[PDB]
Amino acid sequence: PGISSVIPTVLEQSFDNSSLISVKELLLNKDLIHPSILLLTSHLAHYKIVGSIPRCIAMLEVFQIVIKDYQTPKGTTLSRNLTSYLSHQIDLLKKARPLSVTMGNAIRWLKQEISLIDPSTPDKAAKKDLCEKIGQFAKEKIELADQLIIDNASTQIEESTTIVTYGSSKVLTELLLHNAISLKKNIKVIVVDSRPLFEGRKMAETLRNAGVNVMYALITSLDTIFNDVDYVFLGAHSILSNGFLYSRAGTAMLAMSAKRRNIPVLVCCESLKFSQRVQLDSVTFNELADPNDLVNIDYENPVERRGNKGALLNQFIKERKFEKKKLAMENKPKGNKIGGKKGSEGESKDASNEE
């Protein structure tokens, strides 16, 4: 594949469930590697915008492009080394940064598709239909799911609502936009954001660009707007067969607060977000990047400054670790709405048999 390891930073005595670091700067790249994937990796290394949902879509697009580029060889067959290539790609992705359940599902589907179509069929005719099928899948298991979510929201949400959210949950943003402009109702939307990621800020900016009244929030306090807050949706990434949620940042805290004060929380998701794997703590599987998001003194991301911060090894023993993905609870997110419209997260795998 190329070059691996050779990186600074200690193994850390506290929290080491997954490996922590990689390929950022390109040197001596292989001939067969498609550059799009490399570009994507480069983006992800220092990404602000995407989270869970759009990433998968991007991956799908890339795969489609790859398929379009590839034709059946004379020596090797269509199902000879494709699988190997896929595996290699997956490995590369893993090396870059750990992935989502949706992505895995997509991979599985692709594998199934590969298994399905026999190599004896005409090649031109084959991918003509295959690509169409892929497109159809994309339409159904993403856009249609989103549409369904929107419609669920429509029946449920009262005549004009104050809405609170966290992160970069693209579907939810889209829904908000729809509420603002398409169906036309009052949108007192409150967005919270942390230090390491400027996702919330970005979302706010986007809302402003569409013409929405936004309330910006940080870690130090949340309750200042609560003690008034009436209806809340949480940030989503992946669901388990427990009834729990594996999501981003201090969403758990927010959920807890909601539970304490007046009203519970609800999350809407895609029907292909669900896993069959299970966990129950923020120690199980940790998603990590480099401890550098808080080294630069606030404000913007690319700055390059002279000051005081930058003591990972310089002074007498110092560690500056963080986490990205944490455990969201069960007793509080009562709502789960998918391609099967209605249900509770207490019914943690009721749709897994039906699919």
Partner: protein, 431 residues
């Protein structure tokens, strides 16, 4: 560097604020219940001034009275306030000449022009100035600069221009052009004399204006020598630079902190908005410098003072302020506004980025979409105004009104439209 004395300019540009000024002046008017010269005074105090020069001319008596009222006439402070007499609507050259003739200052003196609100430390700057002076004999004055508010797309009138230096920090040129309404000039010429002596150059366009100078014992002599100067930024410093005295240099310093001078209406509005937000940290309404005001920060972005009466079923927005003793019945849809102390209101105020000054009686019903109401200018029944509307002094508004953008309302109880006594553009009575 102990014991200092400075000259400050107040009521610099009237008629620029065209709706106001007839009996009550320009600088006396508050930002949000609090006057603008107070901040300047505070700054001066912080600096450590022992002798204060101040100029009064147009509607001067009232200004003087106000000064007397403010707690600085007593010898508890190291500084005293003295008034310089000058004719109606004047420049800065004549006044400077007068000051020179009078003749008091020995050493360093600071001239501040316009309306400057600062939240910056200056001791370090002073030290730097001192160091510079110590470095070489032929050295003149210090200047301040700041990064502008993102992109100038709503601020249309003034686009600044500066050609600076890294090591010693020095500039010569300055330029302004309109454009968005009707385009004209597309060319600006730059000095080609001596450049490679310092080598390094940093050009910066859009920067916040204030006009501040820390001056040494050269300026009055220079004035005495050459009596052709009118303004300091356009003619004086540049003139001095351009082969007048050999070896004379200036110093520059940059600060990213909030410091804006007021000149127009939209700019003023923006400043007000900024103040409403938590942009300033040494200058906030909860700290209270005067120790007679009781404003404190509250939930859903609102400023308030003690005891406000309001009827049931309410609807409130963001970035607002409500004064003490404002007696309100039913209504209020408050979004982005300032209201002064004590305002009797009948029913309903539809507020969409509005503004209200000191003591305003409002009758029945008002659909307001971004407008300003001035002091003692009482509102009758049915008030309807569009964007950027500005009202003047003693305007006794009665029944039924409709106005649009850029309309200006008089103050005289002289030339301008929208009359004070007996309605505005529905009847003609007055001067």
């Amino acid at each position: 560097e102990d014991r200092l004395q400075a000259v400050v300019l107040t009521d610099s540009y009237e008629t620029r604020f065209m709706p106001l000024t007839a009996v009550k002046p320009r600088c006396l008017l508050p930002l949000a219940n609090v006057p603008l010269i107070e901040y300047t005074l505070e700054f001066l105090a912080k600096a450590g001034v022992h002798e204060v020069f101040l100029i009064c001319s147009s509607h001067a008596n009232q200004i003087n009275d106000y000064i007397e009222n403010s707690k600085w006439n007593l010898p508890w402070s190291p500084f005293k306030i003295t008034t310089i007499m000058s004719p109606e609507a004047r420049c800065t050259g004549d006044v400077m000449r007068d000051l020179d003739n009078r003749g008091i200052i020995t050493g360093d003196f600071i001239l501040v022009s316009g309306d400057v609100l600062t939240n910056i430390d200056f001791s370090k700057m002073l030290e730097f100035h001192k160091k510079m002076h110590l470095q070489d004999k032929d050295h003149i004055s210090t200047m301040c600069l700041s990064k502008a508010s993102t992109y100038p797309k709503t601020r249309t009138i003034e686009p600044a221009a500066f050609v600076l230096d890294k090591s010693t920090s020095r500039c010569i040129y300055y330029q302004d052009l309109p454009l968005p309404s009707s385009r004209e000039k597309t060319s600006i010429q730059i000095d080609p004399e001596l450049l490679d002596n310092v080598d390094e150059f940093v050009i910066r366009n859009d920067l916040i204006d204030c006009r501040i100078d820390i001056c040494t014992s050269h300026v009055p002599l220079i004035f005495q020598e050459n009596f052709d100067y009118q303004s300091l930024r356009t003619d004086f410093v540049k003139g001095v630079i351009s082969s007048d005295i050999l070896g004379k240099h200036i110093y520059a310093y940059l600060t990213d902190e909030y410091a804006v001078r007021v000149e127009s209406w939209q700019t003023y509005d923006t400043i007000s908005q900024d103040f409403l937000g938590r942009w300033c940290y040494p200058l906030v309404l909860d700290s209270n410098i005067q120790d007679d005001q009781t404003y404190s920060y509250e939930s859903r972005h609102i400023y308030k003072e003690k005891d406000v009466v309001l009827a049931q079923s309410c609807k409130i927005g963001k970035c607002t302020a409500i004064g003490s003793g404002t007696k309100i019945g039913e209504g209020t849809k408050i979004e982005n506004s300032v209201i002064g102390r004590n305002c009797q209101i009948g029913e309903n105020i539809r507020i969409k980025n509005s503004f209200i000054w000191d003591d305003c009686i409002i009758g029945n019903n008002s659909i307001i979409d971004h407008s300003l109401i001035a002091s003692n200018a009482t509102l009758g029944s049915n008030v309807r105004l569009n964007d950027g509307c500005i009202i003047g002094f003693n305007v006794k508004i009665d029944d039924n009104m409709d106005l649009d953008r850029n309309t200006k309302i008089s103050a005289s109880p002289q030339d301008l439209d929208d009359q004070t006594l007996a309605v505005s553009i529905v009847g003609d009575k007055g001067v």
